[PDB]
Design a protein around this ligand. Sequence first.
Ligand SMILES: *[C@@](C)(CO)[C@](*)(O)[C@H](Cc1ccccc1)NC(=O)[C@H](Cc1ccc(OC)cc1)NC(=O)[C@H](C)NC(=O)CN1CCOCC1
Ligand SMILES: [Mg+2]
Ligand SMILES: [Mg+2]
Lengths: 222, 231, 244, 195, 212, 240, 235, 233
Amino acid sequence: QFNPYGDNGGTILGIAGEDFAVLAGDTRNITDYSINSRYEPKVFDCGDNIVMSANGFAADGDALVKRFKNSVKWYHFDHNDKKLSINSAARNIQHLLYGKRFFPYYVHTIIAGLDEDGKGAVYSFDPVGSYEREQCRAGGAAASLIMPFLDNQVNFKNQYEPGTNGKVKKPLKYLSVEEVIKLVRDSFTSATERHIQVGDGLEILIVTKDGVRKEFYELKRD
Amino acid sequence: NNYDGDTVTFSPTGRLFQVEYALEAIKQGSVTVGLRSNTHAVLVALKRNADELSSYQKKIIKCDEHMGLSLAGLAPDARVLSNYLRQQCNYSSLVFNRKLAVERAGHLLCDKAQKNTQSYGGRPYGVGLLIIGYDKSGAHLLEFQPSGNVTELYGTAIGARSQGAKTYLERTLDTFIKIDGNPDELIKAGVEAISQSLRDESLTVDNLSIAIVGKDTPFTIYDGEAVAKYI
Amino acid sequence: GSRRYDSRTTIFSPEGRLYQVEYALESISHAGTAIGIMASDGIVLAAERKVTSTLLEQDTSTEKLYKLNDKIAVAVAGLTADAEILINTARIHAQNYLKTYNEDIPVEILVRRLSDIKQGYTQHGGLRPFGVSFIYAGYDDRYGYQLYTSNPSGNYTGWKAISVGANTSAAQTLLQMDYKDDMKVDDAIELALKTLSKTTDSSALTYDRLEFATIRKGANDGEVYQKIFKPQEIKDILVKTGIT
Amino acid sequence: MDIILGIRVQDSVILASSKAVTRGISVLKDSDDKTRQLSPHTLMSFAGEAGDTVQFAEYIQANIQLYSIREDYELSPQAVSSFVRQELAKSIRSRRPYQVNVLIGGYDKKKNKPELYQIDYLGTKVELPYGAHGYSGFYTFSLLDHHYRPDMTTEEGLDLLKLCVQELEKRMPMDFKGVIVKIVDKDGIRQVDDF
Amino acid sequence: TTTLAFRFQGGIIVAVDSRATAGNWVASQTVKKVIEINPFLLGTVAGGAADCQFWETWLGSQCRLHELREKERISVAAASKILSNLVYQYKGAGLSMGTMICGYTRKEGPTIYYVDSDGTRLKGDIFCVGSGQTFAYGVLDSNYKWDLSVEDALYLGKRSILAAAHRDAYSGGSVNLYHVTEDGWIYHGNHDVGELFWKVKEEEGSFNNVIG
Amino acid sequence: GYDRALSIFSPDGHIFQVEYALEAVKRGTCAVGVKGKNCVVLGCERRSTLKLQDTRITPSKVSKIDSHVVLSFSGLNADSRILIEKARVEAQSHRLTLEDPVTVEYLTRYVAGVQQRYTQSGGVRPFGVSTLIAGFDPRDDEPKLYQTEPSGIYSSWSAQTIGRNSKTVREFLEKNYDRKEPPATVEECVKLTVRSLLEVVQTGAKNIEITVVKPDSDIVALSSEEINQYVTQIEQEKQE
Amino acid sequence: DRGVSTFSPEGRLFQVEYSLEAIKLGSTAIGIATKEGVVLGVEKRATSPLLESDSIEKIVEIDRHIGCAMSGLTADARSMIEHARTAAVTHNLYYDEDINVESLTQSVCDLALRFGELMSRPFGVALLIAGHDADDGYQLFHAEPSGTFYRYNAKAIGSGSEGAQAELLNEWHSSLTLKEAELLVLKILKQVMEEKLDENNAQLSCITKQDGFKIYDNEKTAELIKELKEKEAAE
Amino acid sequence: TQQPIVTGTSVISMKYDNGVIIAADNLGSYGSLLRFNGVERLIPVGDNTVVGISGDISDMQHIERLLKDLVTENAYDNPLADAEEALEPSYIFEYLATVMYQRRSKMNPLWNAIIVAGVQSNGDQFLRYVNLLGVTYSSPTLATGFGAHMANPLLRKVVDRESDIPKTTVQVAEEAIVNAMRVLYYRDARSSRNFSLAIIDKNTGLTFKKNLQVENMKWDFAKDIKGYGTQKI
Ligand SMILES: *[C@@](C)(CO)[C@](*)(O)[C@H](Cc1ccccc1)NC(=O)[C@H](Cc1ccc(OC)cc1)NC(=O)[C@H](C)NC(=O)CN1CCOCC1
Ligand SMILES: [Mg+2]
Ligand SMILES: [Mg+2]
């Protein structure tokens, strides 16, 4: 019988700073035990300082990004070139995803950008439209490997202040763009080591008030 | 007389009076000018107001990053047609990953307006449009009429007293066509062209409306203090 | 287009009347007179056939009086063809009600639905109304014996005695004169015939130019019987009352 | 939903209906009234699939109330039951049938007689002296076969009903949290508060 | 999930956990399971996350349209029935929703309505909904009285979620407290189980099963 | 389907079909609504050119929409049935979804909306009917009286009349009805309603119908003798 | 007869032009936009003294940040308001934000020309849509049955429109306060109204960023009427 | 819901310095039966694109007709149909990619794997894949079916990343393709010796080669192999 879904693998990662936000994702594309492409980008600039990635089943992922990109376009036409805020984009995406509640997009979606106060924002979605703003999210095949590492290093979970008898927690603080990119690169190299569907290359999209900048790094090709 | 009740009726001399009355709505509309070079295309539109307390009716509409039009006549009909163009431009992008040709844009509008002139119940569109764009074959300027007749031109104008601007452009043809790689000078030629259609009134800051598209210029509209440069 | 040829059947006059309903009533006023008279122990339906020919088969004929179910009957005035469309609808509606509730349909409910159908033709659809007026004669266990009338407007009203069709003005005056509330069926039979005999446009009222029916509780113990009179039975009742 | 009983006596109809609403391993509510008043002298108890029960009961209630307003007249218990049966008879051959079983207890004011109808989700109507839906019947029918008499009073009917509830509380596996009892007679519908 | 809400002398307490699960994977620890429909209406959510999130936000829109049209705040009964009639249309399609519509109006007073995805709609004084509802019931029922103070009621609601957060593997993260009065709902803060557990253990002397 | 735009604008800015529908209302038998301190009374004219009628079965002029709301009308009788039926269905639908009976304002708003829809829908003519909708909101003792008309406008009235010679009875009510002090009791309200109809009717025999609506679904229709007592009392006081 | 969507020889739609005549017969409605808020005021015009004037609802809420006043065949406005309210709430559901006043007006005006041989005729009512958003601030729009809408600093529609519009021309300036605007609506309404202006036959409302859209009570409007009369007599 | 009947096997392709190469054998298999031997599975669109199709042949012939019809439709009211407004590989691909995904979304897929090879108007090499699921991806080397498992490894030794493309000549690239076709003939049980090859160069244009054969095959070592273990004779 025909199976309409497939697993194109890979993994994505979003981290929010004080006045910036990053959305990273490996450039490997796979089916079963074969590599399809070593460089197939899945993190996209969608305009209005919103970056998006829909990892999982690439056909559904590309379809969704394509529709959201088009949703941004018609938002400008219908509302006098108004800028789509990140919170509004998120809600719009929920309706796109839930629109196919009974024949879902097989993708874990993550968008990143800046909120209306100029602060870094990462929103993350399930396959049917459930969403939540966070400082931190990993999505895709190696999400289970990366996510707990982020809890520890970004949100300082299970870390207490030395000599306080485990009474005072390590205080929460924003990370610099330099420190965030270090965590991203270490997250992806670690995920590449232990997950077969992750590797080849890493592409990071950084979002500041100035615009959207890109950075590329090599990953192990085995 | 007896042959103007609806669009489905021909006159004894072979005329469609409802289409001609729709054409009349354009002549009542405010003047707008279109002109192009080989690098850029420019729309200049005189906006109209109800009174001093009212705003000035927006004449120019964007269809895509590389295409847009100005209107003269019934504004709601222009909204319907511009929306149709937006969808057709967008269909070409999503399906074929291809920017819609300005010539096809005209062909599609012609065929849409035509269907309204041959069927009972419906009515002709009561608006004229000037479509500008930059595609794979350079800059373009189209003139749409609700009869269905679309025409590609170097320059033109439609609306009330549009004959003044149209004569000027017919004289200036050789000059403005060669304004290549210079947006501001092409706009100046368009602002001088629309000035030939003015009576009593002159071009003010919230009266004038200018749009431009070109080689390395997306379709962008200029209103308010942004057009003060050209007065 | 087609707009040119539209009569616009469902519109108001400047005075606030429905042209087609009014003209349909003018049509009905030329139809053979039909009379209904409700007594304490039954109902009478009498109707005059439209200018009969001597070669018309009289015994196997049905022009004026129709049976809707075992308990309800109607007298027609207007276009017969139109009436038959409405009658078959009414017959079906009665059977739907019986199928749904396992109870015979109350007279008013049937009358309302049939009147609602006529109303629809005056308000929407762009069709001509039904050129028909009914006299409903029926019985149920709520209100007992009931007489109603409906006309092309879709408006219906209840009556003790009523006429439709031709010469209703003259007929209604005569009924209003001789009718009284403690009346019996046999008396109502006589009144119905006497009224037709005086309001008729014919020279003399005869058996072959009449349809007649009664709805009595004259069956055995607490049950209703419909009697559509035969030609010979009309001939006898006409002699018995002393008209011929 | 589980236990709904009905007992027609001389001058009234008595409907008992369990109070428990269970879902999974949790009794969510122990005071649930599994009935609706269709008209002043007609009461319908119901049991079956979750959601369907109330949705159906209220839909019927609305229709009967609409009839009452239109005609300014109360429909007979027989007529209401026939209407209900037809609705279930349509339902069973639908895309998604109502899975609801009902008892219709009513007092016919024209006949001056109490009437009890049992209708299952298929649209199977029967008039009975006593009725039950679900597993309840497997105990109560035989019990009533023995103890029921047609000429009983309402008070005798309630004692007969107590005898059923006691037997069910003894032998039924599930805790149904007692019953709400309602009486339908010439004076209308009233609830027995202490049972 | 574990969500509860109970009626008492001083209004309504509403308490929820904040965990989201994708099987045994902990999807989130910081999710919002109380939707603020208006200043007088709350909606708790358990079950399918998107189903809950989407349709409860939708419910808020329908409640807004009601007060625009009727110039009057929607009743708790009417609001709950809009949602229950909606999910009933989708019955069989596979929606998963365990909600509790809690609020106050003049005509009704404090009211709680349990509504779930198979069409059940129940008015009641106490409800617990979710994978850890039984654990919450155990603590809540054994300590519940109508005459509880606002201070004690808030704590009991918090302690009942904590109990479930502990035992139920598919509940936890943090406790979100609310208190509904005649004047409207009042938020009583987010309480992380990471700190709250040890705070409760020490002060209350409970949770002796755990290695202290 | 029949599509024709029957209700349309004319050069002077009038929709003649809606205005001609008002003429049908003006032809209709008079109907009056007077609301007191704790009640509303609906009076209705019945033309006396129809004898040999059966008043048991003849459709009554005042119709119950729900147990707490009533609707009388003036104009085309057949049309009124369609509005009443729709209103009755909507009343049950409201109880089903909101778990609360309709307010008199809501029911009126619905009926008026239906009437309006027929003034700009293709293939249909406007309702030749104006209504007086009266009653009491659930758990409320404040009397409500509303009026609708073919165009679709509706509004609340302390007292109001519609139908033939309504301008005469409206003239009567305008001077006789005091806003500061409405009819304190049921008797006072009914008397004022009968008095107002006696300006127009002809005879106070079987020509006047009266229906009294009180709070908590307390509606009752007066009989001939009960109404005749008011007629007898008013005429004796008049001779002065 | 003749088609519904027919053009005149002058190039206008007959039915649209006739519907404008209906709006001229309607009761007066005035709107004034300031930097402190937008004020909307209407003439109630009760046809009889027995009619309870508080039931006359010619000013209407669309959302918390958008109000609406009407004039003409006011029964036709019901479906326009319903659409507007749904559009406003629907946009909030899709985008988690307030909807722009212009976008709302445009949505309403899209219904206007959806008539022909869709509904059978144009609307016989004009709307004054007042509101506020974060982008363009306080705005007043005039929505016609032609499908056209103009933004206004101030606008009068209805029977006394041309007389009131000429008065608004002179009186309006860009530094008007809210209190000044309130009185200015009352002043101009009293001039064009047939009957004498009071709290029962005229209604005021406003929309501010802070408090949103609010219809004024008869007690509040009465004080503004009394304040208005005193200020005119004071010079 | 389909099942493929008459099927075509591997389509292999790669980029080189000035353009792209694509190849596919001429077999139409009917399960294990090698039914049809004259099947062309490379279909040129204009003079700048070649579409290579594997999978169900009936669906391939449908796609042929769609492309044939696309050229016609593009020519309508288009004076620049053979110039600026000619069909690009990227236009042709996106069209097919749209169709493939729409069909899978209606649970009625075109049971194919497609590779659109061509050269754009600005001289850029175009090479992109799409299949029955609507999955799309691009790479210096692309292959379908067994090609993905056996050809790609060999072709990636030539062009392992983007920077290797300018360093690869048409002679080297074609040799790698022809070698890959031989390896597939050795090891793919539903392949044939006869095949077609197409080269789309930005300078020399479209070169379509028919009736090629796999040659220089190593079979001589077979004679020494006796039995399956312990046999000597
Ligand atoms: C507890 C944690 C039980 O898991 C709660 O019910 C919690 C409630 C909740 C409410 C709002 C926001 C987040 C969480 N429910 C979940 O976390 C929920 C559990 C669940 C999963 C699948 C179900 O099948 C219908 C039912 C319940 N988890 C999710 O919804 C997760 C985040 N999403 C998915 O698993 C995506 N699936 C959902 C079903 O459709 C296919 C995709
Ligand atoms: Mg490997
Ligand atoms: Mg746990």
